[PDB]
Amino acid sequence: RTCLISPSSTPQTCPNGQDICFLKAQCDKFCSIRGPVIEQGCVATCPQFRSNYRSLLCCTTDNCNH
Amino acid sequence: RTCLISPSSTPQTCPNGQDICFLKAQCDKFCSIRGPVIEQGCVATCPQFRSNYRSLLCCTTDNCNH
C-alpha cells in the first residue's frame, strides 16, 4: 500500500485503487511565516502538476522509487 | 544557470530563458537490458508530466531545491 516495500523498506503511499505516488512541496498556511513545507503520500489521480508549486514528485506507479 | 547556488552548491540546471528545473526517470534504449535510468537538467517548459514515466521531479522555479 505504498511505493517502497522490498529494498530499503521506506514505503509511505496508500493508493486505494491504482498505484500512484505523489509528493507536494509548497507553502502551507501563511506562506510567509514558516517558508515552504513538504508533504507526501497518495491521492486519487496525479493532477497535471503545476508551475506554481515548489517541488512535485509523481511516479504514477508503485515500487518505482529507490 | 541552475537550481542550487548558495546552500550546498549543487546546481545542475540551465534555463535559457525562464527558470524551470526538470528531472527525467524512465527506461532509455532497450528498456529491458539496463533497467530504468535517471537524467536531470533543464528544458524549455515543464510538460504536463505523464503517468508512463518512472519518476519526474519538476520545480518550475530556480533555487527551489535543498
* Whole-angstrom distance, CA of residue A50 vs CA of residue A54: 9
* Whole-angstrom distance, CA of residue B33 vs CA of residue B58: 27
In contact, B58 and B49? CB cutoff 8 Å: yes
CA distances from A62 to A21, B32, B38, B41, B46 (A): 7, 19, 17, 25, 23
Nearest-Cα residue of chain B relative to residue A55: B59
* Whole-angstrom distance, CA of residue B37 vs CA of residue B58: 17
Among B20, B63, B26, B62, residue whose Cα is nearest residue B42:
B20
* Whole-angstrom distance, CA of residue A17 vs CA of residue A61: 12
Q: With CB atoms and an 8 Å threshold, state whether B56 touches A57.
A: yes
Which of the following CATH numbers is that of domain A1-66: 3.40.50.2300, 2.10.60.10, 3.90.1580.10, 3.40.50.720?
Answer: 2.10.60.10
Within 8 A by CB and 6+ apart from A33, the residues are: none
* Whole-angstrom distance, CA of residue A23 vs CA of residue A42: 8
- For chain B, list residues whose CB is within 8 angstroms of any CB belonging to chain A: 20, 36, 46, 48-61, 64-65
Sign of the alpha-carbon dihedral angle for A10, B59, A17, A39: positive
* Whole-angstrom distance, CA of residue B64 vs CA of residue B20: 10
Within 8 A by CB and 6+ apart from B66, the residues are: B4, B7, B8
In contact, A18 and A61? CB cutoff 8 Å: no
* Whole-angstrom distance, CA of residue A36 vs CA of residue A30: 10
Indicate the residue of B46, B53, B57 with minimum beta-carbon distance to A51. Answer: B46
Q: Which residues of B touch A59 (CB under 8 A)?
A: 53-55
Q: With CB atoms and an 8 Å threshold, state whether B65 touches A55.
A: yes
Q: Where are the domains of chain B?
A: 1-66
